[PDB]
Amino acid sequence: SGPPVERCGVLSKWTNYIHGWQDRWVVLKNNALSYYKSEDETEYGCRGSICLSKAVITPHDFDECRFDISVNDSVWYLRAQDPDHRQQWIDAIEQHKTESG
Amino acid sequence: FSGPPVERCGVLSKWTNYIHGWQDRWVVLKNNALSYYKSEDETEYGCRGSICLSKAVITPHDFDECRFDISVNDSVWYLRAQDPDHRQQWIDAIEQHKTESGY
Ligand SMILES: [Cl-]
Ligand SMILES: [Cl-]
Ligand SMILES: [Cl-]
């Protein structure tokens, strides 16, 4: 019964062992977390979207800026700038997931 | 009005002042408001302005066809899209959303 959760910003995202961690623009909307190469490249540049309905969000125990998001078919590994911002993201994603159900 | 609400997010240039001129902002149309976001570190963002659409006036510029202004009695934002087609997409979405959010 309150306003929907919204969030956008840059997160560092694991790509692969060739390029390692790379900054990506991440947007929370439409029961999804979506990412793009950058803020300016959203028109044609969605590089992925993870539906939140059954998504599991796991803060890391050793890398205190890291959280992982997983559905059956994929896992994204993400790092925020500090642990407070990590917690803001986790809290937003969880609140959005709840509200969208 | 029965389908999902009209929502948009994207970059638009926004007028600041004559020193810094047009500056890109992340702009969001949602829940009867146009809002914009800024960051001081290119990483973490926060909403730095919101306009309620109920009585908003959207004025496409006659000569600068990339520009539209949105005003309520107390405030005005001057906004540019990258071209006039993109301007029109924004204008049309805002005007439709305004109607659909009304009573
Ligand atoms: Cl949004
Ligand atoms: Cl251990
Ligand atoms: Cl542009």
Residue numbers in the entry:
A (entry chain B): 20 to 120
B (entry chain A): 19 to 121
Report text from the authors:
While vesicular trafficking is responsible for the pool of ceramide used for glucosylceramide synthesis, the delivery of ceramide from ER to Golgi for SM synthesis is carried out by a cytosolic lipid transfer protein, the ceramide transfer protein (CERT). The N terminal pleckstrin homology (PH) domain is responsible for its localization to the Golgi by binding to phosphatidylinositol-4-phosphate (PtdIns(4)P) that are enriched in the Golgi membrane. While the START domain alone bears high ceramide transfer activity in vitro, inside the cell, PH domain binding to PtdIns(4)P is essential for CERT function. In this paper, we report a crystal structure of the CERT PH domain and associated biochemical characterization in an effort to understand the structural basis of PH domain mediated CERT localization to the Golgi.
Crystals of the human CERT PH domain spanning residues 20–122 were obtained using ammonium sulfate as a precipitant. The final structure was refined to 1.75 Å resolution. It contains a curved and twisted β-sandwich that is capped by the C terminal α-helix at one open end. Opposite to the capping helix, the other open end of the β-sandwich contains a bound sulfate, which likely originated from the crystallization solution that contained 1.0 M ammonium sulfate. The sulfate forms hydrogen bonds with residues K32, R43, Y54 and R66, all of which are highly conserved among many PH domains and involved in interactions with the PIP ligand. Nuclear magnetic resonance (NMR) studies show sulfate binding mimics 1,2-dihexanoyl (diC6)-PtdIns(4)P binding to the CERT PH domain, thus the sulfate bound crystal structure likely captures the major features of the PtdIns(4)P bound state. The two copies of CERT PH molecules in the asymmetric unit have distinct conformations in the β3–β4 loop. In molecule B, a major portion of this loop points outward and residue R66 from this region is hydrogen bonded with the bound sulfate. In molecule A, the β3–β4 loop points downward and K56 replaces R66 to interact with the sulfate. Structure B likely represents the major conformation while structure A a minor one.
